[PDB]
Design a protein around this nucleic acid. Structure first.
Lengths: 74, 119, 138, 50
RNA sequence: CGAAAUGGAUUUAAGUUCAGCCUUAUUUUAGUUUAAUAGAGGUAGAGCACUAAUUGAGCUAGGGCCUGUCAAAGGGUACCAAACUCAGUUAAACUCCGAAUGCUAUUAAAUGAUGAAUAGGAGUGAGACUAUGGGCGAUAAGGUUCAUAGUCGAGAGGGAAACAACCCAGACCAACAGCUAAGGUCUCAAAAAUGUGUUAAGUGGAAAAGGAGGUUUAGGUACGUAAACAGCCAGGAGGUUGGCUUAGAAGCAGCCAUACCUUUAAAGAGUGCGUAAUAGCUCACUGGUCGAGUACUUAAGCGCCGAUAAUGUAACGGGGCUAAAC
RNA sequence: GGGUAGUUUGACUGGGGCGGUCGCCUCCUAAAGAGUAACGGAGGUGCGCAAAGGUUACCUUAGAGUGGUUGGAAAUCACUCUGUAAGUGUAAAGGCAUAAGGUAGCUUAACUGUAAGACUGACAAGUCGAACAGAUACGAAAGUAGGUCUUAGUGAUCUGGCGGUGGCAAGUGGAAGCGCCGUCACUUAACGAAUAAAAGGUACUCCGGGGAUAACAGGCUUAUCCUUCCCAAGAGUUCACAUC
RNA sequence: CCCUGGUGGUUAAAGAAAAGAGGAAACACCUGUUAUCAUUCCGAACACAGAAGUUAAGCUCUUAUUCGCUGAUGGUACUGCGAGUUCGCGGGAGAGUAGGUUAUUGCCAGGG
């Protein structure tokens, strides 16, 4: 009577790639995620898989509004 | 009660979606918004980098003495164009502001168009 | 027996149980309580043995409240096997108790009879106990 | 000694400048040095330089 | 100068290869630890607001039971019980919440080649234990499999009687110099004396549930110089075989309470012994002789029993020690 | 065509065999960045869709209660409260009110050449991407669209087939053929794929090694076993402990 | 300037419920479907055309904070490190309690 299961996928390495306050240049990836765990603010864009990336050079910042987190470049 | 409340709620949802679809206005190409009351018709040009109304117009203005018809809003758009040209703005983004682009708004917009404003 | 009638998952991982109790540590429904002085697991079946003891000692005098419900499977591999396949099978049910859990509560009878009945109950549990009157009423 | 202690604390001590028992170093107490000394208080002896 | 026993892949699992770790040469200068400021978690913990489990009352649909019953509309509801209310619990695959450390960015100090790039040469890819967090196991294994750090590995010296992984500490060589760490200072065996208490078990110098008028100190509840407790001297009853079940049950098979009264000093529908049934002997109960703490408990410091294998005292290293024990 | 000959007949594995498993995706284990094992705990998958894709515009479920032809607990209709618990082709998770959910119109961006800068990473690979030229779809426009709310529905090289281009063309001019671009054929599933092509026995056995690994003993552990002990409901005419 | 309307900024609910107050202007209700426009039926919504009437509702303001939301100070859990051991240094919840809360503000148009 062997084990009926034991099966796991490859870890996808999600999470925040650039920390709030760090300096990024155009096109950097900031967050990798499934779904808008973090939403888009000023000067960032959302990829087709909800990746957060920087449209211009600046400093990352996270804000909170009504309990939702927004990422911006300032 | 609830029916009027939900009508208001739907209008707000439409307004919000329209706003973030068209994006914000900048001093070069500010945003033109309208408001259609049961009596009158209002238009404002806004620069969101400041939250400032660069120019505005409405049928309340006594001197214009227009009505609330297609003809009247045609003339009103003419006046708005001549008022904006002297402040040298030619590019605008048209926030329909929760309304449907048809009828009065169509005539307003086309009137701004025949007189050299990029909307 | 005492046992849950439906479970999301049949088997669960044995944690490490530690620390005193920060909740369910006060006499609520009755007059006299049977606090524990250790942290351990009380099986359903020891629970019902203690319950029979208390209830039988009490000649209809009052009521007995059980403040723990097992809801924790305890798996055991078959008798003669090796360490291979994995997570054998549920055998009996355990309840978690920490130092300070009230664990049992009694109502109605005189204090002497309650103390006797509840030592009679404590004789069948695997943890040190203490009998407590409300200590803020009489 | 540094033998057998935690890695983080060995790093702190080498950042203070002490490598052996019997090591002597004079330092000016500001917030940084105060934090390092607090980390490694159990392995040091502090005297004051009048 | 100085590793690795890890990651990925493999007709691979005792092999090999790339990365990781090492060294040499050149170039480059910016690791590393703090502190301050500012960021993203969902863990510990906690909580029931979601998904499930669950305790006791309150309420009440619905289901059956019973009853003016036809199976019309009904009524009595011990229950079987949804939902709801109050109180109270459980969760790795629950989260309205939520740290500490850890991680990232900047700056200033502090430490001084520990970073990185190119090129030559590798080795390694069997790990082990200890301190924490876990999974599997049987909260068994010097078990198995991961994470952080240490040591061994590759590490000599001192300590734990002996004892790679524990404690202290990194051996350039020499000195018949000193101060110290762990650990010790009766003796084997280099090093301690004094102060205040505790222990009678050689506890120290193995261990559980439980039992326990051992003792030190502290604190409650009963009770007391207006006589408590133990002893000693008396009563310890009358109504009343309490009504009974039973054959009997007269206080002591057994049911029920003893809101059963009186003389009351005090006498219980009796504490035990024992009688078929009593009978009979005793006690709580109360009075006199005596003359201060006693009777039940609570928290700690040491103790007692439980204690229990086979070559030989053998669970202090030995001698011995009432301190030379705590 | 075993008459004869050359060979193959996998690995992981709490010894081996038997059984089970082998790629990819989701969650937990995972100890609040990333990563992290076991024959640890639960599932899915080798697709579907010419719209269930693109865009514009407009709408909002499920549940409870309530009033209603059949109609009943529950179908469709209306209102109140609740406020995403509903629904998203397909597992789970993360998301989804501006909806990524529902409906309708038009439509093919389910595009060509590219791509600053990155994420993840032994390598091979995989992933995101503003913006630019060509040419469309929708929209008044701003703008969006390089398939699908996101993450699984996959397969290297060699060989060969098909279409295009006209680069190579063994003296020259052609051609066979090859190269280039587009593209098709592998449960190569043991899924980084030893061959285009592969099962067993040996107790008649042999060799090189291993306590890296089993059987007999020693050691660790005590589930099981054995020996007691704690609690005493009771049985014993009454009487827990004469005894059980 | 204030009121009203429009449109933003700063996030703690700036949440709903009930009661009361007004309406000059403004906003909304409201009126007709005939023209272009819209619904898988319906001028409800959308759209066009307007001024008969009203605070009734929406809206603004005022209320007992009725529900919700927010919530200290101490203490506890937990935790990094430590030759002090349930101790030494530092960090510090959740729940509960005392409370609190029916936003604030920039510039455009109308007239006060």
């Amino acid at each position: 009577g062997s084990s009926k299961n034991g099966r796991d996928s490859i870890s996808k390495r999600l999470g925040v790639k650039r920390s709030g306050g760090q300096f990024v240049k155009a096109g950097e990836i900031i967050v990798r995620q499934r779904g808008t765990k973090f939403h888009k603010g000023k000067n960032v864009g959302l990829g087709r898989d909800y990746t957060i990336f920087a449209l211009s050079s600046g400093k990352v910042e996270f804000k909170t509004l009504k309990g939702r987190k927004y990422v911006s470049i300032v | 009660m609830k029916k009027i409340k939900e009508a208001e709620q739907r209008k707000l949802r439409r307004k919000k979606r329209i706003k973030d679809k068209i994006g914000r206005g900048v001093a070069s190409r500010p945003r033109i918004t309208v408001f259609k009351s049961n009596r009158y018709f209002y238009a404002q040009v806004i620069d969101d980098s400041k939250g400032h109304t660069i120019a505005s117009i409405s049928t309340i203005e006594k001197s214009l003495n227009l009505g609330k018809n297609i003809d009247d809003v045609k003339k009103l758009g003419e006046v708005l164009a001549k008022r904006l040209k002297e402040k040298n703005i030619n590019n605008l983004i048209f926030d329909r502001n929760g309304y449907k682009y048809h009828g009065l708004i169509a005539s307003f917009a086309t009137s701004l168009r025949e007189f050299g404003i990029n909307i | 027996m005492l046992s849950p009638k439906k479970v999301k998952y049949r088997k669960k991982q044995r944690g490490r149980l530690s620390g005193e109790a920060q909740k369910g540590n006060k006499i609520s429904f009755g007059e006299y309580g049977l606090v524990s002085l250790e942290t351990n697991f009380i099986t359903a079946r020891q629970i019902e043995a203690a319950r029979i003891a208390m209830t039988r000692k009490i000649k209809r005098g009052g009521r007995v409240w059980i403040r723990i419900f097992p809801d924790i499977p305890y798996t055991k591999k078959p008798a003669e096997t090796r360490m291979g396949k994995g997570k054998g099978g549920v055998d009996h049910w355990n309840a978690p108790v920490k130092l300070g859990t009230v664990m049992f509560e009694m109502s109605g009878v005189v204090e002497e009879l309650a103390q006797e009945a509840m030592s009679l109950a404590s004789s069948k549990l695997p943890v040190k106990t203490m009998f407590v009157v409300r200590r803020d009423l009489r | 000694s540094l033998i057998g202690k935690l890695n983080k604390k060995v790093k702190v001590l080498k950042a203070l400048g002490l490598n052996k028992i019997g090591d002597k170093k004079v330092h000016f107490l500001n917030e940084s040095i105060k934090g390092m000394l607090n980390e490694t208080i159990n392995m040091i002896l502090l005297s004051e330089v009048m």
